[PDB]
Amino acid sequence: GYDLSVSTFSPDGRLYQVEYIYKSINNNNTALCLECKDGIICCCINSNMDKNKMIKKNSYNRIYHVNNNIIITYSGFDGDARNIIDRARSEANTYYYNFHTNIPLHILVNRISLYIHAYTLYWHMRPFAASIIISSFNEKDKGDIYCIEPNGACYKYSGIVIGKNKEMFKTEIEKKDYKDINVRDAIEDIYKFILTSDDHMNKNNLQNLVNFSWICKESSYEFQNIHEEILTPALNKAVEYI
């Protein structure tokens, strides 16, 4: 009876609706961000759409950006995450209007965390069902990656995975330190981890179900999606390895 409203604590001091949101997110499509020596690399594996064959090639992209220098991705429902990303862009716009400089990453993360958290307080609002990764990289400060949970918790990482099969992806990513590995070498490792972890993914759908993006030295520390010419030899080498 206590699990029918986000605004009610259960006798053991838990909000069951947020836990059910966590269960919803853990079944959704995988997303990961990884700090590297020269950049951050973001990768979204949309394994759920392996059934739908008529979807346009690479149309579905869960990787978005703010200010052309902050990557923002998610695992969860598309509409809620679009709402959060619109809030992030609004916060960046308001900050630049007030102060004439771009929003710091930690301030944006805190504000979006509060925005997510506010919907877990009242009996009439649906809490957002999405975990949100927000990340950036700079020449001086290196990489900063944050993950905002559906409960409003925000935590900083060197690398993070959310969504389906995140345990296996985390286990494979943890095998080696990536802060002394470049992003171009890291793409092959990400493809190998996807082939070993997600059972729906295979050689014939890696090219059209996976979104890639990064912020590194080669992109002048600004947002970009990986071109096909860089992706194709990497996934070919991963398939040959596997």
Partner: protein, 230 residues
Amino acid sequence: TLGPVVTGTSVIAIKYKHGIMIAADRKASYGSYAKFQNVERIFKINNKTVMGFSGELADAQYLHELLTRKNINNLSEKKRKEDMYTPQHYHSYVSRVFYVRKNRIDPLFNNIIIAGINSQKYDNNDDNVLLYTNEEYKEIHKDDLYIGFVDMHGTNFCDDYITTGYARYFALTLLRDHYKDNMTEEEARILINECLRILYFRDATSSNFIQIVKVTSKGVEYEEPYILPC
């Protein structure tokens, strides 16, 4: 803004064979006081769009901030280079802003030039845009180039060349006499320098310290500012 206090003087924009050439002296006057003499009055909107102003500096800076966030929001939603807003889109947006503020009796005391390149079929600068970091010029048809004027009352139009402020009398006479299609960079520079020379001699709010900006196939290039030769 009840009226102007810190004012920028004329701006002159023309089409030439490789794109748009837009010029303005770097002076902002506090009435008869030439208080500021190294001010920027030509703003980059995007890689194929620039904005220039004559009149009050505060209103122009407010408009520049508006167009900056409009460009950033455009970039956030972009997936291909054709999704980038054109100079005529920004001209329509600025005209609407001026029109609504005119209806509120709260005008921006400015005359605005919005200039640039309408077509994406000349370069791939918008495929990978860089906001925080900067071969021969391609010949561009004048139909693919855009220069547009807006005033305080929202009267908006476009032409092959546009002038604001005192340039509407001094520079524009020489432009209407001597302008021709498909001018080279040298000819456009010479014509603009002649116009700015006449303005320097006859406009008391004018300076001989010029800023030139070129919108070409290789994007927006801010030339090093110079004193008028001779």
